[PDB]
Each structure stands twice: as structure tokens, then as C-alpha cells.
Amino acid sequence: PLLERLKRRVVEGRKQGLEADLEEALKAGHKPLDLINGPLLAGMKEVGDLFGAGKMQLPFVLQAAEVMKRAVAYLEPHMEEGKGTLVLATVKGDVHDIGKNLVDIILSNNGYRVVNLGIKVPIEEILKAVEAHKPHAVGMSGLLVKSTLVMKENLEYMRDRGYTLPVILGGAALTRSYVEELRAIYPNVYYAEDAFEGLRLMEELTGHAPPELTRPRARPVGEAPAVPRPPFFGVRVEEGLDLATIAHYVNKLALYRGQWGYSRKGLSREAWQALVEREAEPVFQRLLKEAMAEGWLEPKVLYGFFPVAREGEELLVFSPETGEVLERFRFPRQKGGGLSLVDYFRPRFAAPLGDEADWMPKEAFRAGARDVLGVQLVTMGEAPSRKAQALFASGAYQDYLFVHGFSVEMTEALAEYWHKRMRQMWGIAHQDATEIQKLFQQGYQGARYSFGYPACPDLADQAKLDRLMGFHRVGVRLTENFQLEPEHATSALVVHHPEARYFSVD
Amino acid sequence: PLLERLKRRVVEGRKQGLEADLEEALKAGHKPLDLINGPLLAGMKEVGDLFGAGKMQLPFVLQAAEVMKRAVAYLEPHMEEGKGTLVLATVKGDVHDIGKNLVDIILSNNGYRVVNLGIKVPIEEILKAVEAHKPHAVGMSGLLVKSTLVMKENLEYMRDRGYTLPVILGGAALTRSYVEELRAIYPNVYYAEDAFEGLRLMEELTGHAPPELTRPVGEAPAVPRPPFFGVRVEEGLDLATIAHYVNKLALYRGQWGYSRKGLSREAWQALVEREAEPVFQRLLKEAMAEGWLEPKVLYGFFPVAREGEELLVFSPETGEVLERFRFPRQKGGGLSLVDYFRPRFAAPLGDEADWMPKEAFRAGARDVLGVQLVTMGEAPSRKAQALFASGAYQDYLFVHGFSVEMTEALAEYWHKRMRQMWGIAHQDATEIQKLFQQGYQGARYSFGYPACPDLADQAKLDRLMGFHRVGVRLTENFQLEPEHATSALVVHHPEARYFSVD
Amino acid sequence: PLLERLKRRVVEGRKQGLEADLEEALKAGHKPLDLINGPLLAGMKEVGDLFGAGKMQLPFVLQAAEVMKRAVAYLEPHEGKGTLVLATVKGDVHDIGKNLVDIILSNNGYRVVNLGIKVPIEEILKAVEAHKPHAVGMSGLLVKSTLVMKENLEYMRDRGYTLPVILGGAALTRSYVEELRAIYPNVYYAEDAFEGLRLMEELTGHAPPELTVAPRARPVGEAPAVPRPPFFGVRVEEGLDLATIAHYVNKLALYRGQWGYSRKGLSREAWQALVEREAEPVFQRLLKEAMAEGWLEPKVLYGFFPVAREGEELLVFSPETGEVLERFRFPRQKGGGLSLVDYFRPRFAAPLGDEADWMPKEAFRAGARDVLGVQLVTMGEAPSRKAQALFASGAYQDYLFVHGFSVEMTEALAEYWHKRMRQMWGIAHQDATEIQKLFQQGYQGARYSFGYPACPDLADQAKLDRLMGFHRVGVRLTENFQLEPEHATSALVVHHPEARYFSVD
């Protein structure tokens, strides 16, 4: 009756009057340990089952996790180990902790001890924690292909040093079949698609569940009608940036679905329209207002234009002062010799289309530059990472998810806004829509390409952009895996060519 | 009884019901002259004695001076001169009148006639006022060393033309011993440290007392890339943002003259919260609404290089050497400002050949120097002069000091902005109390500081930047007009710091 | 003899008959190169050794250099020891020291690239990259030129040069160049051309490394009057008599100082012989030739201004408006002795006699109580043009003679015009009857030229240029404030009867 109420309080996620009910339980015969192991955990189990069915959204799971967190905190003085220990780390060179920290929340509030070592953790630091704590498994996380090769190298090191403990790998670029191939290196390695697979693996490994998981041709790219003149050549900084203006360019469906994990599949269209207006849209307004007042988004842009030319399959970047070739980008071509990014750039020493010899930088034009490439790096600073880490540490799990996702999509909004500003500076903006819904058709002249996209997939090519721009100027650095630190930061090549578009290689 | 009340009204500084008491005094046998010379002056004397003891703050002295000002103004119709006449001037090329105008307030409200000629007054204009008014003394004021050499030249001129009347000198750079040496030129010359020494001298000279009183840098890890090369303007800055960067202890103690000497730490904490902090909030709010602070910035970055003991500034268009700064060295060949700059034609640290302006790099530029000039416009000078003219002496001191420290706050704020633009801000403090002194990469050196004391070097900065673009000019003594204005060199080098030559 | 005769012909310095002897040497076995490297150079080396001893005068060294010059010129129709880039520094007009280094090094076998006068460091180093020399040679007279040499070394070290730099100059000492090795390690001092030869021989690899109660002046009282000038302002005088100017030459300054005839290595009988035989005939020849051909062009810019002392400054007032145009600050002797300002009446001081009657009205009302004479004299660009023609054609002895003559005739013109200023001013009446007595300073007042101890700052010539307009007699100031052309000098002319020459130290 009371125990059913405490079990309901987890599932529905009802904070207010929890401490009154727990106080009544202990004086009516029940022990603090039996409340945690009995009704509070039983609710947390059914939260995970409802997520497996597709009946419960991810923000309500973290609201359920918060009730368990508060329930244990109030029961800590009165009590007078857990199911098992997990060492958990994002791999060397990798800055992304959202996937990992969701694994920390679900496993901790399902009873397991979780040692979270943080981001950019070398294998030596990981295995020092293995010997200190003596866990039932290690958990390794990483976003992109370079991080997956660090995971491989960590397994090579682990097999060589003589470890045989279970290793759980999670990652976007990582697939199930690739982890099966890594069992050539390290036999006791397992793939986890999400946190709840990580929970199943740990239950199977520790001995609380039976072993099942642990068992045509493209149209020709012509000449552009002109090469447009930029306002300047070089790279410049913009800092005075209005967050209310930036907020207008957010992909709200990418925020609400992609980052926060509200869903239309397990609900009706009436309940979707309700869920956005009731829950999601008020959080957006709250975070925007709070971010303006407190100042935990710090919008900055490093932007510029360089004289360029195609030579062969390479794009050459020339110095606007000296005309010396600073960098060479080689982009991949589609199979059967289709489209490449270099097809949008004019050949070196080619006959000018109009009056580009009047305004192209003198030495770069004499060295053969016949085109211009826009470059932008945008960031919201280290401040949103600092704010999210404070919310995580204090145990506000729902607000951690909300602030992380908001910070991701506000950085993308700043990239969208600045791309529009680059087009206006360019003189290619006059075919844009004034309103933002039409920009999600890609309704403008040219395109924006981030490194890691299909048409320019090598994240190493960010290093060339850093040498050209100087990422330090807006507080941004590259890791050993060429990811941007802090994570709320994204760079792009900006292409004027009217035929330019997104395309894949396969 | 009534005369004790009028004497109390000066000392405590009680305005309301003064006019009623003075009306009662004249119909009870007392003449208007004897009220001024008797009880009203007796209060003003004891105000000065309490200041000598360290028992009374400077704002309350000016509140006491206001009571005398109103008392004389109401007694002007009932009369149809004074203890003596003073001609008073800030010297040619000099813009600073706070020291002078405090001498005007104390001497005027101690009975003396004061002819205030204003700022930038040549000796010919001073001596025309001497012949018109026939004073007991001349008063000459000036801030820095170039102004003291104008004072010397004025004394040479005066001795040669055959004047022998007393000359009172005041100034920051002026010392007691230097004025004693100027008696080789002009025997009747006297030093005044403050207004009350000026009062003692005038009392002695006019015949109430006997005549004389007197008295190892390594390489930087990189050269950072600036946002641009050249100069830009920023206008319409947020005064509420600027207000956060004020040195409040420099305002409250340094400019306004509240003190912890003579009081307890309980009464200090009271005095700040009760009196000082409400004046700050009142002046800030009023300055925003009325618009008597006009925050403007002229700022820029230039390609530079060290050759010997000179810093060369190169054109970002042509690469021609525009200006050469020679900075002083510490005694026994210690630190100089040039030690923070890379040598001309020196081997690049990283990629500076790629982005440094082409001709300046070919002419040998290997480094970048930030420059800023900040101002609050002529508007605060105009506002202070209106408060002075109408007789609100306490509000004159408050608005002057506020205007000085808000200009310095704007310099502090913009230095932070220069660091953010330059890419060197990521070691800055989250709080503003840490920003005073170091707490950031590099340093800001204003002309007239110990590390670069020659005010002539501002002329080179004016030719580079164009000070006229934000309403600022240089005088014959190279001071910035209007006075609520300061320029600095901004140095990126992480080992940069404040130092003296001596 | 064979080849001892050609070696003798350089040393004793007999030009005419050389081509016959050189023709006889070839076809008796000897090659043209071996004659130059063997006996002709051997004589040129012993000429320099005799000059080091003090046994041979400098005119005979250049006569010996001429024999080598003609010997090589005749052997030109049918490389050397090393290359030298040679320049007088930016702002400096004096090339006699440099051009003597050019004569001795060229006739000792070395290639000399003479860049000329007022050469910036960028122009010097363009010649370094073109010719690829074994050393650079930098020349300059006065202290401002030595600071340009310092700045050139700073620039050179910074741009990454390490090739030997030889400095020569009057203001330069040996210890100062040792201190410049803090800036540029491979820098060397050369006292004369023969030290420059030794350095170059060592650098090029033809010699081993060795080089590589104070008495107090009387108080200045008031003058008996301020004399009235002919006018206030500035005027030009041209077409002066060179025969008249010739009378005022310091012959001992010409013969010893400029031409380099000497005693000490000779007796007093041989001195009296050497003046009468060699020196005095050259003076008469150059004077007569200068009159006929016209390669001295004597010109004067001269004037008088209302002045007054204020403090340690002399103020110059406008004779039209009475505005203070310029302020001159002169140095004082140690222990507060004499200064040039002590000869000028104080500003606003009580008139001595009738000066209020004739002093310009506004300048007197602004406080002018005294008058300052100013003169700038020149012999034109013509003597520089004449000397350069003698140098180019290879008449090295006549180059030295015409240079020295031109220097001392300009000083003579300054002496003559000072006398004329005294006559115009009304202070000439008690002048010296003879010119020997004029060297004892037997006249009223004194003449102070810029660079002398009483007014040493050459910057103060700029004030005089703004007043007078130096362009009126073809004269300009350089960035080092030297007068271009070099045969030109300015002076302040002081009426005061107690005025005299004094040093500061």
C-alpha cells in the first residue's frame, strides 16, 4: 500500500512528498536496504521495460532516475555493496560524454557502482582504476572512426598486458559486426547500442540474468555565373552575438526528437502537438532566458575567405598576403568517377569569368588563384560544458539532458545563422528565404560542408583549417583524434557554387 | 546663541532654515559683514581644523563651504572686496582643474576674492588679470613635469618683466624642494600641497600671520593573430557593464576623500554602505538617463618589431616604418617595454609569414601591438562645470571623481575586450576584483606611467590612430583634451607586468 | 735594373716614362699580372710602411698611387685580391676619408665598390648581394653619423649578415667599436686607410690574424651699447673676390691639417724648404685656376634679428610681428661658468642708450633688447664637382689638394664675411691691421659656428634655416643636420666686446 506508492513515485516520477512517505515506511517495520532493493528498484525496472516497449520517453526515465537518487540520499543517514562495479570512460582524444553519462545514470539507479573516469582517458588511467576497484566490467565510449581505432588499440594493450575482464564498447561509428571482429583481438568484448543494453550485459555478467547477449551518373558541374567578391581576405573574429537572434535558427525537431528524445511513434498526433507545447517548448524558453541572464552560452565566430584553386583532385589554399600555397585538401570522389567537392572550384591559372583580377589578392592571383572559399568555426565556449557538468554532479539528470541538447542545437543554430551572414557578405544571399522553415529545404545559393560529412569525411583535415584560421582565437583546440574541444563547437567549408549540394560516396 | 547656531550650521552643514536665521540676525543689531567675518568664518575655520586633525572627510568640507556660499548670496542685496584678491589659473597646455577649483572653493568661502581664469591660460592672459584686479597673489596649477616647466618659464617671464607679487604653485609632479630651487628665478614663490596650505599662505600674505610657510624576458610561445590590422571605432557602450569594472576604493578614498584614518572598521563599513555606495548608484542612473557620460573607444593593431632599444611601428598597407618608440630602461640595464617585442627580421615562431601583412613582414615586422584610446566625451566636463558654477560643490567633487573612475573602468573593460578579440583571454578571471593588477595574459601601459612616462609619445599614437575620430585632441603639453580620456599600449606577452624605472 | 726600376718608380713617384719601362719588362719574360703582383705592389706596400714610420708625406703617397693607376690602365688592353663595398652613411656628406680608402685599396689590388655619400643601409646591402664582398666599409665624420653606423649594425645583425664591417671616422674611437661588438661581433675600427688595408689583407687571406681649485672666467658685464644693424631680416651677396678671400686663409691649417705635410719626421730647415718648394706654389696655382675656370663660387646668406635672453634660452623675435620664432638653448661651462646667452641682454631689460628708437616696434614691445648677427657662407657645389672629376680621371694628388683648398677657402670666406658683418654693424673700428693678428682674435665680438664647444648641437642649424632659408645659396640640411654641399658653414655673430672662444669641459 505504502510500498506500492513508493514504487509508483519512481515510475510516474513524483518528487514532492517522497521524504514524508519514506519516513513513514521505516517506522512501520521496513529496513532502508529493503525499500531500495524492493519497491524503489522495482519501479526503476518497469521504467526500463516501458522504454523497451516504446511507451515512455527519455526525459521521464531521467525524472524516474532522480526519484531513486533523492530516495537513496534521504536513506543514507538512517541505514546504520551493490550488484556490481563498472569502470567507465570516454577514450583518449574524444570529448563526447552524453552517451557515457546516460549509462552512468541508468546503471547507478539500477544498483551498480559506476566509476566515471571522464573524457580523454588513456588506457593506463583506465587499468589503474580496474586494479583499484576490481570491477565486473570496463565500459569504453567514443563517437567517430578515429575513436573506434583507439578502442581497438586499448584492446590490443589489454590482451598484451594479460587482462580477461569483460569490456563493453558503445559508439555511433561502432557497429555490432565490427565488435564481433574485435574478438580476434580481445574475446570478452561486447557491443552496447544504448544504456539499457549496457544494463542487460551487466546483469548477465554479474549473475542476475541468463546469458543471451553475452553468449546512373551525375550531371556535369559547369562554370559558376561569376566568382563573387568577399568583403575581405583573411580570417576575422565576431563576439557581439545576440542569443535571441540565434534562437530563431534552431532546428526544434532536431532538439525535441534528436537530443531530448520525445517521440511521435509511440503516441498519436494529438498527443505529439500536446507534448511539444506542454513540455518541450517551455523548456526551450526557460533555457534561452536563463542562458541570457546567467551567461552559460558564450557565442563566438572565427570566419574568413581564402583565395583557392583546383589543381587535379586537390584544392589548393593560397596565402592572401604572400600567394604561397598554405594547404592542399584532397577530397574523395563518388564510385564510377562521379561528384567531388573539387568540381565546385575553378582550375589553377584558368581564364577569369569576369573582373576577378581587379580584386583577387595580387600574389595569390599571380600564383594561379581563381576562386574563393569561405571558412567558419562557431562555438558557444566552455561555459555550457561547465553548466551541464554542474547539473550532472548535483543529480539533476533531466536538466543535464536538456542543457546538453540545447547547447548542441544552439551551436548548430549559430552555424546556420552565420552561414546566412557569410552569404550576405558574399553577395549570394538574394535567393534566400527571409523565414527559417524554408532554410530547412537548403533554400540558398551554395552549401556548408563540415569535416566528417560523406563528401569530406577525414577529420584530420580540421588540422589544415586550424593552421589557416587559428582555432585558439575563439578558445577552440584539436585533440589527438582531431575532435573540437570544447564539444559545443563546429567548423565548415562554405562553398559559393550554385550547383553545390550534399552527396554520399557509396 | 543665534550666532552659535549660524556657526554650527557651517560645521554640521545644515542648509534648510539658514535664510530665516540670517534674517533674524540683521534685525537684532548685527551688520552683514560682521556675520560673515564673525560666526560664519569661525565655522569654516573649525572645519579646516577638524580636517587637520583627521576628524572630518572632504565631502563634508564642501557641504560646509556650500552653507557659506548660500549665506553670502542671501547677504549680497543688503550690502553694496574681502580679505584679499587671488588670480588663479591652470597653466598653458594643461586640462586638469580639480586641484585649482578646490583652492577656489576654500579661499572664496574663507572671504578672499578668487579670479578663476580656467584651463590652458598663457602667462600674458594671467598678467592681464593681475593688472585688472591688482591681487595679493597669483596661483598657478599643473599636473605633470611638462606643466612644471611651463611654471618655470612663467616665473622667468615674470621676473624679467619686473613682477614681485607672491606666486603659489600647486601640482602632483611639483615637490616642496623644487619650488625652493625656483626661488633662484623668482624669490616670492611658495608651494601649496593642498587647498588648506593655500589658505595659510594667503592669510600670511594678506596680513593675518607672518609671510612664509612653504614646506629576463624569454620568447612568447606564439605571436597571436589580431582580429584585423588598422584602427576601428566603438560607440554606444553599456554604462551598466562599464560600472562593474570600477575600482570603488580608488573612487571612495582616492577621488572623493572618505577615510578609515580617524575611524573604526565598523564606521568604515557603515560609511561606504550609507553614504558612498548610494552616490555611485545615483550618479550611474542619472548619467544613463541624462547622458553626461558618452563612452567611446578608438582601438587597433599594428605590425611591429624591435630594432635595438627602439620599437618600430610598420604600416599594414605599405610596410613603411611610420613611428619609432624609444622606451626607458631600469637602472643597471634592467627591464624595458621593448623587451616584450620580437626582433626585426627574427626567425618566425610559427606561421606568422602566412598572415602578417605582406610588405610589413618583408620590411621585417615580427610582432603585433594593440593600441586603445578610451573617453567619456566632453559631456562630463560640461556637467561638472555646471555644478561648480551654480555652487553645488559636493556634487562637483562626486561627478568629477565618478567621471575619472568610469573612464579608467572603460579602459579596464576594453582591455578585456582586446584580449578576447586577440585570442589571449582564456586565462582571465571570472570575477572583476582579480582583474585589477595581473590576472590575465599581458599588460596595458598608459603614457605617463613609470614604464613609459614621456607624454610626447602620445603624438605618435595620434598620428597612427587619429584621436579626433572620438573627439580627443593633444595640447601643447601632450595631455588629452577632454581630460576624461586615456590611451594605452596593449602588450600580448605573458611575462608583461607593471614596473618602475627608479 | 729589371723590375727594381718599376718598384722604385712607384715609391719615388715618377709617372712620365712608365709605359716605356713596362713595355721593356714584357718580352724580357715577365707577364702583366706578375708585374702588378710583384714589383709594383711591393713598392705600394713600402710606401705605406714609410707613412707608418712617419718618413713620407701624404701627397707623395697619392703620387705613388697614381703610378700604380697608370701602370694598370696601360695594362688593361692586354679579378684581384678581394671586393670591398664602401659607403658614407645616411645623412653624411664627407667623402675625403672614404675616397682615400678607395685609392689605397684599389692600388693594392682590391676591387672597391664606392657607393658615394648619404647611402642608406638598404642600398649598402643591395651592393653586398650584387658583388659578394669580403667586407663592408662605413664612413662618417660626427657623432650623429656614428649613431647611424650603430643602427646599420643593428639592422645588419637582425637581417642575419655576419660579414666583416670596417668603420672609420673622426668621432669614432677604438673602444667604442669594441662596445659595438655587443650588437655586431665582426666589426673593426680603422684609424686610417693603411689599417683598412691591413684588415682587408688579413680578411682576404694575404696576412696572418692580429687585427682580426678650478680657475673661473670673469663675469660678463653690460656692453657699452647695443649697436644698430644696417637692416633687420636676411640678405644674399654673390660674386665675391677670391683674391680678397685668399688673404684670410690659415695656411698652416691647409698645409698640415688638410694636405698632410709635416715636421717631426723632418728638420726646421727642410720644413721651410717644403712649404716654399711644394705647398706655397700649389696654393698660387689653385687660386689662379679657381679664378679663371670658376670652380669656387663664393656666396653669403647674412642677416640680423632682434633677440633677448630669457633664462638659459636665447629668444629670436620676428622683426615684423614681434612673435618669438625660435629659442636657442646653449650649454654652460662646468661650475656655472660662461655660456653664449651671457652676451645677450635680458628680455624686457632697461635700454642702455637709444635702442627703443630703432629696435623693431612689436619685437621691442614683446621684450627684444639686443641684436644677433647670422651668416651662412658657401663656395657652391662647383668645388665638389671639380674634386669628383679629378678623382674619377685618377689625379689623386690634385683631388687632395683641391679638397683641402676648398675647405680652407670656405673658412677664409667665413673669416672675411665676419669682418664685413663688423663693418656693417659699426663695430669694425678697432679691428686688426694684419691677418696674422686676426688669428689672435683682435676685433670686437666673436663668431660661433655650429659644432664648436660654445654651440655644439648641429640640430640648432634647423632653426637658422627656418629663419634665413638656406636654399637661397644652394645649401640644404641632411637628416644628420650637416650642410650639403660640404664646402659650407654657418655662424652666430656676437657684437659683445667681452665675447671670446671657450670650451665647456
Residue numbers in the entry:
A (entry chain A): 663 to 742, 746 to 880, 895 to 1185
B (entry chain B): 663 to 742, 746 to 880, 899 to 1185
C (entry chain C): 663 to 740, 746 to 879, 893 to 1185
What wording appears in the published article?
Cobalamin-dependent methionine synthase (MS) is a key enzyme in methionine and folate one-carbon metabolism. MS is a large multi-domain protein capable of binding and activating three substrates: homocysteine, folate, and S-adenosylmethionine for methylation. Achieving three chemically distinct methylations necessitates significant domain rearrangements to facilitate substrate access to the cobalamin cofactor at the right time. Here, we use a thermophilic MS homolog (tMS) as a functional MS model.
